[PDB]
Amino acid sequence: QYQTGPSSFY
Amino acid sequence: GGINSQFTRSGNVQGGDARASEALTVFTRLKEQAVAQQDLADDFSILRFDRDQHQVGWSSLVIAKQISLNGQPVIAVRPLILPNNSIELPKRKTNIVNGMQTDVIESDIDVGTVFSAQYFNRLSTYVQNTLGKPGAKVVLAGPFPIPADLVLKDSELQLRNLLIKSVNACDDILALHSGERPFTIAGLKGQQGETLAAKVDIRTQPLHDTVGNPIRADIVVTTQRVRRNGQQENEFYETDVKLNQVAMFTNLERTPQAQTPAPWVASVVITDVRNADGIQANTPEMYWFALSNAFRSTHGHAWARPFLPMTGVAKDMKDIGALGWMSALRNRIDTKAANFDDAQFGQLMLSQVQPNPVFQIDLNRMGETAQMDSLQLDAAGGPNAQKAAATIIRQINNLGGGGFERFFDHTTQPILERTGQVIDLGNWFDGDEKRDRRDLDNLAALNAAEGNENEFWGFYGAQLNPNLHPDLRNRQSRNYDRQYLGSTVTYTGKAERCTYNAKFIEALDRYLAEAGLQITMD
Amino acid sequence: GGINSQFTRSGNVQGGDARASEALTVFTRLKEQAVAQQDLADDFSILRFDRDQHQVGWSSLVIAKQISLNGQPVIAVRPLILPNNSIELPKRKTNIVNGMQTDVIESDIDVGTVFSAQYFNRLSTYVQNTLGKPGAKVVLAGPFPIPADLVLKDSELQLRNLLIKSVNACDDILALHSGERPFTIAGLKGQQGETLAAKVDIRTQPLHDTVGNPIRADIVVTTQRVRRNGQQENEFYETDVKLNQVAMFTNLERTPQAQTPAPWVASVVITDVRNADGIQANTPEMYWFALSNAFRSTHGHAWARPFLPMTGVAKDMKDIGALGWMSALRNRIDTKAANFDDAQFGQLMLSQVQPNPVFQIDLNRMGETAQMDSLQLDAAGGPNAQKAAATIIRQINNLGGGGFERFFDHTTQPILERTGQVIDLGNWFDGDEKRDRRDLDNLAALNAAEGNENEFWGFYGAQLNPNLHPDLRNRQSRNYDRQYLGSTVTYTGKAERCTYNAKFIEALDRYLAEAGLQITMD
Amino acid sequence: QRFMGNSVIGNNMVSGQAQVHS
Amino acid sequence: QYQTGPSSFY
Amino acid sequence: QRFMGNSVIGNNMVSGQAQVHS
């Protein structure tokens, strides 16, 4: 799994 | 589909979304009113993201503010999801096998799964096309859904506060991207002979979000500036002497030992971290400074204060006497008695509770502090594990000088750990007022089920069984809440629980203490 | 503070008080409407006292009317405090020691402590600067706070009555300062063959203040003018024949005698003193004339009338049978029985209640009659003890001729005595309607706690223990009210209890009787 | 020390009866 | 203690 | 296989006490 999302840092 | 175009009966039915246009009109009126009263500046735009002509799960409202940096346009967006109760999204099917029989499980879809990478890509492309800048850079500022079952006709204050906070967040992210002076504790000395004091508090009514969402909070730790000089003037008048606020509540976990160490261990869960109301700025270096106050709750075992019985009333939901059900004696210890007092309450806590607590956080990718919760979730584990840890270390170094390496070594030491637990977010209407769904914990379940240990053990396994599939655990947790709490439960989102490293908290506290920070209290 | 000026994010949040501007607008509209209907005269002004730009605990509304006396301007002010529930004032900390351990007590701040000398000085300076007269003399007319949890949108009648009463009070104080004819009973003869009659009354529903605040009242004594001539015309029509009204209720106190004198003594508490609705004038000499009616309640032991059981219903809160719990027989005397009647009710009262009552008053520095309550509190004891007594004697001499020295000697006889008791003022919402917090008395506590004498004794000591600190007594009293009454208690102010001199009441009554006053009744 | 009652309320007691014309 | 307040009489 | 408890929560435990100036 380990779904991710948008990040402003990178 | 083609059937309507094949027969073409006069008149039109359905085929529209009516919870977007009204919200847009309300937001435009609120923005005009705020601009009239010299509260904001006419430099941002409000746009509608219709699901019908973009083919997305949920319509959204986006607040875009753009500036120019070295000739390169930069756009900051704060989408606001608008879930609707009049339409049903298709569910997700999963299959599990038991012996010789296979069955299908119908799950449910939350707001968090809707906001995927493709959703943000389409939103960014739409904003770029609308604003006339095709190649402009777009940076996210943190989504915040508007909960359903909320009447927009009589909720003007919450919407106004949400709009102002969204503008503040856009300004914050734009300033961070541009590059400004980092916030450091070296500038907090004030050079006026004042000191910082931390006050602990025990509460019984839940805290409220900016949109009226209740939040469970039993222990509240705040930090204030004490400026009491000799002949202090302004008696009974105080000038906003308050900086931070952290809401905490404790929960009990049982280690698997068969039957000198205490059977139960107390784990403290951090729900909300926020700054003072007066402060309109939110920067990454304030978050760690506010979070450092959590460790201070162990100065005098203040985490155990809510556990002691109150005199006069007994809700019987947070009773501590149920802990004796599995003790050496089968029955429960009877509080609310003339003989019972603090004399043997300490004895009970020594003989059945571990002296040291455990610190945990309920990270939420859709909350107000989404931009930090997502970063910490990435730092916990995933493809972006080194970058997040490096960013966190850099921020901590920027807050308070430098030289954090002497206390921590991120190269060979995990910062955050994922326990593989998913927590539902909802609210249930109690007889008196609306409350929080997280009021149901291990102690509450133990109180509800007096002597049947097997049912309680099934409930406990429904939370953290690694063998059982997560969908079944969510189903069991949703059934148990209905069984115990009531029929008024209304889920609103999802959250994840994580455990901080034991050495990390101590290293952070020691680094801040050595960096010239002095806090005094009882 | 400086953090906001250091980062300067666009947009503004909080930083304002919204329960002052709306009240000012409402008061201006009400004043305009009253002036339009030829109810008042355009000679007074309404001003706002903002806490933000004056640095005070609470914002206030002031009604100033100014006149000229011998070329010297005189300004009369009636401030109205505006407490708000959206902000919390800092609490007051106190330390007490028990053996080898010291602890900190967090008290609470009332409205009365806010209105200090510095507050009035700043208010007077602000009014003088605003009205253009720097050296004008300013005289107080009596503060009156507006209770919180009151919706101003639908309370127009109470605000209108409060404004008219405030204007009347300003006129009264201005006329008193200017100097007018004192009110004397010699002008009450009427020279038309009429007589004054006093009517006693027993009530069960609480009286109401000008702002809807309930007041406990069991015995009501009124004075009327009876003008029944021979062929009296106007059948069924009455012309405002009513002058005074005094609200009284009795309470039982137990003398400390170990176990022929009765164990319990009855003490009568005077709550409210007021004139007729038709009379728009309030002068100091009417207050004593109205207060003289209190002693007349003992003509036929009318103070014991509310104690007798009512037929048909039994609230079980004011039951007199609980008095037998500590009697020679442990159990309680069972009323509501066929055999029980007035035949042995008199026997019980003779054998367990002292024949003579005790008179007490609940002085309040923030009530409607603040200007007299403060004077009596000063006369009770303090730096201004001789001046207040001399003023009271002068007023009593002015009311009814003179020669009060033959009945009283203020030089070597105290007028009022302070018992060192502080009474909270609040209201609790009963199931049917809102009631008064003072309904809970010694008999109510005795009824609530059937046989446990120790708990009742602890409650009784929580009121008048001289050894225990006052803050602890207030804490215990606030806990007991929550324990017994309910969760709807809402405190509004503070009051003090005082005991009149036994000889003073008799001397006043005899002086009025000898001064040509004749009152007849049953 | 435990509270036992009010030892000063008994000093102030009305001796007479209300005088009315009737 | 014996806290006091403004008085119009004096 | 039946669940018995959390065997990994005990690895992370605060050893010290909060350090305050007081």
Author numbering:
A (entry chain F), E (entry chain C): 622 to 631
B (entry chain D), C (entry chain A): 48 to 306, 319 to 581
D (entry chain B), F (entry chain E): 590 to 611
Report text from the authors:
In response, one family of large bacteriophages uses a nucleus-like compartment to protect its replicating genomes by excluding host defence factors. Here we find that the bacteriophage nuclear shell assembles primarily from one protein, which we name chimallin (ChmA). Combining cryo-electron tomography of nuclear shells in bacteriophage-infected cells and cryo-electron microscopy of a minimal chimallin compartment in vitro, we show that chimallin self-assembles as a flexible sheet into closed micrometre-scale compartments. We find that the shell is primarily composed of a single protein, chimallin, which self-assembles through its extended N and C termini into a closed compartment.
